[model samples]
Target: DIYKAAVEQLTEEQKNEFKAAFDIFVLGAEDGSISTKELGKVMRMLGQNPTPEELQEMIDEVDEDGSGTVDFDEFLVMMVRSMKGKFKRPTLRRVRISADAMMQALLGAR
Candidate 1:
């Protein structure tokens, strides 16, 4: 619960805003083709939508190594922190495209 734990160090408004942006990331990970309800569930765990200040908190938290860049570990920490459970090696059920690939698809849709 690094996200919540990190959020504990933040204000209420900050938590809400962090939740919002993080929700976007979750939705992005799930890809936009999924229904909004699916995305909403993920967002619920994310707490609430974030404001500008909270967004800054996300930037800081993700830069855990303090190198000003967020890596996969930092991302998972921030995400799983909000989610109330441990990670399990579920059988890889789906093939996920790279983030850049997803972005390309989104852009192509425009």
Candidate 2:
């Protein structure tokens, strides 16, 4: 899945951290989906303190399947996109961060 592919780009240490982070988001969610309420809590934890509308916007961006919540797959895509944004290299073009490239980098990791 994309989650595994995105995580494959990271070091072994980062892989563990990613899984732990994923678990934290899904903890209290009986449906295994992270609700907007949970996302707001995490945002506050990160010191962002997003408004309710901001949280809704985030969910709207990543909530595939029209579920109104982020599933693991959607979460992975969002996380990978964020990772790409933060870690993008100057030597490479922005197009290099496509799904195919992500798959290769993640799966090609040691």
Candidate 3:
């Protein structure tokens, strides 16, 4: 119950869009998780060029189980954390940091 309520901080619209959004970003991969390759598309769509190593680093930062991929649950944390504002922000681009950095980034929310 509590874990489900972790859905807080997100608007109902956000929940829906981002839920679909992940799938939107993850094209053709029915695996239900995001690999570094898939992530780069979302990344480049949001920002400019992101290095392959840095893209994987972003995944690694948010990847809870080290599955070498980002499932939706882990993807959700990054989404929520990005909006939480408790997470850090930068004054630059392609800087290559950690997770929870997008959807808002992709959606241009902040």
Candidate 4:
């Protein structure tokens, strides 16, 4: 019965979407607030009854700017970083170039 319910309710798209939503929810729960839209969708997919306040909290947490919404890029970056912490840090480099002088020196032209 449960298997049938899962299959019947979750279409191909919904099934594909479910994992991402779950990831968002878990990440939100772990560190930040999730977007209201995300919370609603994830809750609906999981068949869990979530309160309005909960969803709003999630939105607030993720929308660190307090903009009341989380863009897809914003959400995705957080999700990825959350899943795999600290992918890489920026590298600093300093270099000097003297194109004309280098060319003259190589060609032996004064």
Query: Which prediction has the highest lDDT against the true structure?
Result: 2
- Model 3 quality (TM-score): 0.61
Which is superior by lDDT, 1 or 2?
A: 2
Q: What is the C-alpha RMSD of each candidate to the true structure, in Å?
A: 20.1, 13.0, 17.3, 15.2
lDDT of 1 by residue, 1-110 (tens): 43636544656676567566655645544442223344344546779764545554556655666644344445545655665512333323222345667788889995
In model 2, residue pairs whose N, Cα or C atoms come closer than 3 Å (at least 3 residues apart or on different chains), thus clashing, are: 8-106, 9-106
lDDT (0-100) at residue 99 of candidate 3?
32
Q: Tens-digit lDDT track for model 3 on 1-110? A: 34445667568888788889888767856687889888888778888699989988988998889898888777777776665332444523334532336545766775
Q: Is candidate 2 or candidate 3 better by lDDT?
A: 2
Taken over the whole model, the C-alpha lDDT of each candidate is 0.52, 0.77, 0.75, 0.58
Ranking by TM-score: 3, 2, 4, 1
Output the worst ten-in-a-row residue range by lDDT, candidate 1.
85-94
**What ranges in model 4 sit over 4 Å off?**
1-38, 84-110
What TM-score against the true fold does each predicted structure earn?
A: 0.28, 0.58, 0.61, 0.39
Q: Which stretches of candidate 3 lie over 4 Å from their true place?
A: 1-5, 8-12, 85-110
Error of 1 at 110 (Å): 76
Using TM-score as the yardstick, the better of models 3 and 4 is 3
Worst 10 residues of 3 by lDDT: 91-100
What TM-score should be assigned to candidate 2? 0.58
Residue 99 C-alpha lDDT in model 1: 61
Candidate 2 local lDDT, 1-110, one digit each (tens) = 55557755767776567667878987878888888888888889888979999989889888878898888667767777787554566435656557678999899999
True lDDT of residue 33, candidate 2: 86
Displacement of the residue 13 alpha carbon in candidate 1, Å: 33
